[PDB]
Design a protein around this motif. Structure first.
Motif, mmCIF file in Angstrom:
data_model
loop_
_atom_site.group_PDB
_atom_site.id
_atom_site.type_symbol
_atom_site.label_atom_id
_atom_site.label_comp_id
_atom_site.label_asym_id
_atom_site.label_seq_id
_atom_site.Cartn_x
_atom_site.Cartn_y
_atom_site.Cartn_z
ATOM 1 N N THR A 50 0.745 -1.546 0.149
ATOM 2 C CA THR A 50 0.168 -0.349 -0.195
ATOM 3 C C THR A 50 1.004 1.282 0.029
ATOM 4 O O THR A 50 0.739 2.379 -0.184
ATOM 5 C CB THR A 50 -0.744 -0.181 1.220
ATOM 6 N N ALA A 51 2.257 1.080 -0.256
ATOM 7 C CA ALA A 51 3.277 2.416 -0.028
ATOM 8 C C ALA A 51 2.899 2.883 -1.469
ATOM 9 O O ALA A 51 2.229 2.450 -2.371
ATOM 10 C CB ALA A 51 3.801 1.320 0.158
ATOM 11 N N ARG A 52 3.159 4.456 -1.277
ATOM 12 C CA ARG A 52 3.574 4.807 -3.393
ATOM 13 C C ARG A 52 4.102 4.137 -3.426
ATOM 14 O O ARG A 52 4.006 3.568 -5.100
ATOM 15 C CB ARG A 52 3.784 6.689 -3.015
ATOM 16 N N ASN A 53 5.816 3.841 -2.772
ATOM 17 C CA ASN A 53 6.789 3.102 -3.304
ATOM 18 C C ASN A 53 6.391 2.229 -3.116
ATOM 19 O O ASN A 53 7.225 1.869 -1.596
ATOM 20 C CB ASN A 53 8.049 3.588 -3.381
ATOM 21 N N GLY A 74 11.500 3.185 5.101
ATOM 22 C CA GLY A 74 11.786 4.114 4.784
ATOM 23 C C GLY A 74 12.472 5.459 6.119
ATOM 24 O O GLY A 74 12.940 4.751 7.181
ATOM 25 N N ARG A 75 13.035 6.873 6.017
ATOM 26 C CA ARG A 75 13.243 6.728 7.304
ATOM 27 C C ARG A 75 12.035 7.678 8.291
ATOM 28 O O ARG A 75 12.138 7.638 9.467
ATOM 29 C CB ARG A 75 14.673 8.519 6.742
ATOM 30 N N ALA A 76 10.669 8.043 7.184
ATOM 31 C CA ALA A 76 10.252 8.307 8.456
ATOM 32 C C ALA A 76 9.391 6.844 9.115
ATOM 33 O O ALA A 76 9.101 6.247 8.692
ATOM 34 C CB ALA A 76 8.901 8.538 8.198
ATOM 35 N N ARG A 136 7.276 5.470 12.850
ATOM 36 C CA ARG A 136 5.944 5.874 13.000
ATOM 37 C C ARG A 136 5.447 4.896 14.333
ATOM 38 O O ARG A 136 5.699 3.382 14.516
ATOM 39 C CB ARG A 136 4.666 5.866 12.206
ATOM 40 N N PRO A 172 0.394 4.571 8.913
ATOM 41 C CA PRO A 172 0.038 4.605 7.827
ATOM 42 C C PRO A 172 0.584 3.753 6.642
ATOM 43 O O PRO A 172 0.877 2.551 7.371
ATOM 44 C CB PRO A 172 1.294 5.266 7.584
ATOM 45 N N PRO A 173 -0.003 3.813 5.887
ATOM 46 C CA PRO A 173 -0.066 2.864 3.995
ATOM 47 C C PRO A 173 1.732 2.104 3.963
ATOM 48 O O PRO A 173 1.376 1.046 4.354
ATOM 49 C CB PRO A 173 0.333 3.735 3.393
ATOM 50 N N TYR A 174 2.782 3.296 4.703
ATOM 51 C CA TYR A 174 4.049 2.789 3.894
ATOM 52 C C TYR A 174 4.284 1.693 5.648
ATOM 53 O O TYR A 174 5.494 1.036 5.069
ATOM 54 C CB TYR A 174 4.889 4.015 3.861
#
Ligand SMILES: O=S(=O)(O)OC[C@H]1O[C@@](COS(=O)(=O)O)(O[C@H]2O[C@H](COS(=O)(=O)O)[C@@H](OS(=O)(=O)O)[C@H](OS(=O)(=O)O)[C@H]2OS(=O)(=O)O)[C@@H](OS(=O)(=O)O)[C@@H]1OS(=O)(=O)O
Length: 142
Positions: free
Chosen positions: A18-21, A111-113, A115, A124-126
Protein backbone atom coordinates in the motif's frame (compact mmCIF):
# COMPACT_ATOMS: atom_id res chain seq x y z
CA UNK A 1 10.26 -20.80 -12.63
CA UNK A 2 7.09 -22.71 -11.64
CA UNK A 3 7.68 -24.08 -8.13
CA UNK A 4 5.95 -26.92 -6.28
CA UNK A 5 4.57 -26.60 -2.76
CA UNK A 6 7.60 -28.63 -1.70
CA UNK A 7 10.14 -26.35 -3.39
CA UNK A 8 9.59 -22.70 -2.42
CA UNK A 9 11.38 -23.15 0.91
CA UNK A 10 8.61 -21.82 3.14
CA UNK A 11 10.34 -18.47 2.70
CA UNK A 12 8.33 -15.24 2.69
CA UNK A 13 9.03 -11.82 1.18
CA UNK A 14 7.42 -8.86 2.99
CA UNK A 15 6.00 -6.37 0.49
CA UNK A 16 4.80 -2.81 1.21
CA UNK A 17 1.75 -3.23 -1.03
CA UNK A 18 0.00 0.00 0.00
CA UNK A 19 2.99 2.36 -0.01
CA UNK A 20 3.38 4.93 -2.80
CA UNK A 21 6.60 3.09 -3.69
CA UNK A 22 6.26 -0.64 -2.98
CA UNK A 23 9.20 -2.91 -2.16
CA UNK A 24 10.17 -6.21 -0.59
CA UNK A 25 12.01 -5.79 2.74
CA UNK A 26 15.64 -6.69 2.07
CA UNK A 27 18.30 -7.65 4.62
CA UNK A 28 21.77 -7.35 3.09
CA UNK A 29 24.90 -9.26 4.04
CA UNK A 30 26.23 -6.12 5.74
CA UNK A 31 23.09 -5.73 7.84
CA UNK A 32 21.65 -2.78 5.94
CA UNK A 33 17.89 -3.00 5.42
CA UNK A 34 16.20 -1.43 2.40
CA UNK A 35 13.71 -2.34 -0.31
CA UNK A 36 13.84 -4.41 -3.48
CA UNK A 37 11.28 -3.76 -6.26
CA UNK A 38 11.23 -7.49 -7.00
CA UNK A 39 12.01 -10.57 -4.93
CA UNK A 40 15.73 -11.14 -4.35
CA UNK A 41 17.61 -13.82 -2.43
CA UNK A 42 18.16 -11.16 0.23
CA UNK A 43 14.47 -10.35 0.70
CA UNK A 44 13.66 -14.03 1.33
CA UNK A 45 12.77 -14.31 5.02
CA UNK A 46 12.06 -17.00 7.55
CA UNK A 47 9.32 -15.71 9.83
CA UNK A 48 9.11 -17.85 12.96
CA UNK A 49 5.82 -17.58 14.79
CA UNK A 50 5.77 -17.77 18.58
CA UNK A 51 2.84 -17.40 20.96
CA UNK A 52 0.69 -14.28 21.40
CA UNK A 53 1.41 -13.11 17.86
CA UNK A 54 5.13 -12.55 18.36
CA UNK A 55 7.61 -13.30 15.59
CA UNK A 56 11.35 -13.58 15.02
CA UNK A 57 12.40 -12.71 11.47
CA UNK A 58 15.62 -13.86 9.82
CA UNK A 59 17.06 -13.02 6.41
CA UNK A 60 18.03 -16.44 5.04
CA UNK A 61 20.96 -15.31 2.87
CA UNK A 62 22.36 -12.63 5.17
CA UNK A 63 22.05 -14.99 8.15
CA UNK A 64 20.88 -11.98 10.15
CA UNK A 65 17.94 -11.33 12.46
CA UNK A 66 15.75 -8.33 11.73
CA UNK A 67 16.20 -5.98 14.68
CA UNK A 68 15.11 -2.49 15.73
CA UNK A 69 16.67 0.18 17.94
CA UNK A 70 14.94 2.62 20.32
CA UNK A 71 14.43 5.11 17.48
CA UNK A 72 12.66 2.61 15.24
CA UNK A 73 15.61 2.08 12.91
CA UNK A 74 15.77 -1.46 11.60
CA UNK A 75 18.84 -3.47 10.69
CA UNK A 76 20.16 -7.00 10.43
CA UNK A 77 22.11 -8.43 13.36
CA UNK A 78 24.09 -11.65 13.61
CA UNK A 79 23.15 -11.68 17.30
CA UNK A 80 19.66 -12.16 18.67
CA UNK A 81 18.67 -9.64 21.34
CA UNK A 82 15.13 -10.10 22.72
CA UNK A 83 14.83 -6.36 23.40
CA UNK A 84 15.32 -5.55 19.71
CA UNK A 85 14.75 -8.64 17.58
CA UNK A 86 11.27 -9.85 18.50
CA UNK A 87 8.22 -8.15 17.01
CA UNK A 88 4.51 -8.08 17.68
CA UNK A 89 2.69 -9.08 14.51
CA UNK A 90 -0.95 -8.45 13.73
CA UNK A 91 -3.32 -8.38 10.79
CA UNK A 92 -5.33 -5.18 10.49
CA UNK A 93 -9.03 -5.04 9.66
CA UNK A 94 -8.04 -4.10 6.10
CA UNK A 95 -6.21 -7.41 5.75
CA UNK A 96 -2.65 -6.08 5.75
CA UNK A 97 -0.02 -6.87 8.37
CA UNK A 98 2.09 -4.72 10.65
CA UNK A 99 5.08 -5.54 12.82
CA UNK A 100 6.05 -3.39 15.76
CA UNK A 101 8.44 -3.31 18.69
CA UNK A 102 6.72 -4.34 21.92
CA UNK A 103 9.22 -2.17 23.81
CA UNK A 104 9.65 0.84 21.48
CA UNK A 105 6.24 0.73 19.76
CA UNK A 106 7.74 1.73 16.42
CA UNK A 107 6.46 0.04 13.29
CA UNK A 108 8.79 -1.82 10.98
CA UNK A 109 9.12 0.25 7.79
CA UNK A 110 11.72 0.71 5.06
CA UNK A 111 12.17 4.48 5.03
CA UNK A 112 13.32 7.28 7.32
CA UNK A 113 9.82 8.19 8.51
CA UNK A 114 9.33 6.14 11.67
CA UNK A 115 5.90 5.86 13.27
CA UNK A 116 4.79 4.28 16.54
CA UNK A 117 1.89 1.83 16.57
CA UNK A 118 -0.42 3.53 19.06
CA UNK A 119 -3.97 2.71 20.16
CA UNK A 120 -6.76 4.84 18.74
CA UNK A 121 -5.18 5.53 15.35
CA UNK A 122 -4.36 3.81 12.05
CA UNK A 123 -0.81 3.00 10.93
CA UNK A 124 0.39 4.74 7.73
CA UNK A 125 0.21 2.86 4.40
CA UNK A 126 4.00 2.63 4.12
CA UNK A 127 4.09 0.46 7.26
CA UNK A 128 1.64 -2.15 5.96
CA UNK A 129 2.84 -5.49 4.61
CA UNK A 130 1.65 -8.36 2.47
CA UNK A 131 3.41 -11.72 2.81
CA UNK A 132 4.42 -13.00 -0.63
CA UNK A 133 5.44 -16.62 -1.15
CA UNK A 134 9.03 -17.04 -2.33
CA UNK A 135 9.25 -17.64 -6.08
CA UNK A 136 13.03 -17.88 -6.37
CA UNK A 137 14.31 -21.44 -7.02
CA UNK A 138 16.26 -22.75 -4.02
CA UNK A 139 19.40 -23.37 -6.06
CA UNK A 140 19.99 -19.61 -5.93
CA UNK A 141 20.34 -19.63 -2.16
CA UNK A 142 24.06 -20.34 -1.70
O1 LIG B 1 6.32 11.14 7.10
S1 LIG B 1 5.78 11.84 5.95
O2 LIG B 1 4.45 12.26 6.30
O3 LIG B 1 6.55 13.01 5.62
O4 LIG B 1 5.70 10.92 4.83
C1 LIG B 1 6.82 10.14 4.31
C2 LIG B 1 6.31 8.86 3.65
O5 LIG B 1 5.34 9.24 2.63
C3 LIG B 1 5.46 8.38 1.45
C4 LIG B 1 4.11 7.71 1.20
O6 LIG B 1 3.53 7.13 2.40
S2 LIG B 1 2.30 6.35 2.29
O7 LIG B 1 1.28 7.22 1.75
O8 LIG B 1 1.95 5.80 3.58
O9 LIG B 1 2.52 5.24 1.38
O10 LIG B 1 5.83 9.14 0.27
C5 LIG B 1 6.53 10.40 0.30
O11 LIG B 1 7.95 10.20 0.17
C6 LIG B 1 8.32 9.52 -1.03
C7 LIG B 1 9.79 9.24 -0.84
O12 LIG B 1 10.56 10.44 -0.77
S3 LIG B 1 12.01 10.42 -0.68
O13 LIG B 1 12.41 11.77 -0.39
O14 LIG B 1 12.61 9.95 -1.91
O15 LIG B 1 12.48 9.58 0.39
C8 LIG B 1 7.83 10.33 -2.26
O16 LIG B 1 7.91 9.46 -3.41
S4 LIG B 1 8.68 9.89 -4.58
O17 LIG B 1 8.04 10.95 -5.32
O18 LIG B 1 9.97 10.25 -4.12
O19 LIG B 1 8.79 8.75 -5.43
C9 LIG B 1 6.31 10.62 -2.14
O20 LIG B 1 5.84 11.42 -3.26
S5 LIG B 1 4.74 11.01 -4.17
O21 LIG B 1 3.42 11.07 -3.56
O22 LIG B 1 4.92 9.63 -4.60
O23 LIG B 1 4.78 11.90 -5.34
C10 LIG B 1 6.06 11.35 -0.81
O24 LIG B 1 4.67 11.73 -0.58
S6 LIG B 1 4.30 13.02 0.06
O25 LIG B 1 4.91 14.15 -0.66
O26 LIG B 1 4.77 13.10 1.43
O27 LIG B 1 2.84 13.13 0.03
C11 LIG B 1 6.49 7.34 1.90
O28 LIG B 1 7.39 6.97 0.85
S7 LIG B 1 7.22 5.65 0.27
O29 LIG B 1 7.45 4.68 1.31
O30 LIG B 1 8.19 5.48 -0.78
O31 LIG B 1 5.92 5.52 -0.34
C12 LIG B 1 7.36 8.09 2.90
O32 LIG B 1 8.13 7.17 3.72
S8 LIG B 1 9.55 7.55 3.94
O33 LIG B 1 10.07 6.75 5.03
O34 LIG B 1 9.71 8.96 4.25
O35 LIG B 1 10.33 7.32 2.73
Amino acid sequence: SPLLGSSWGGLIHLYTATARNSYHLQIHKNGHVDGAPHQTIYSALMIRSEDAGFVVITGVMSRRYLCMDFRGNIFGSHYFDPENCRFQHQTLENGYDVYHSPQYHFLVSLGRAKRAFLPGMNPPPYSQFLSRRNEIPLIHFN
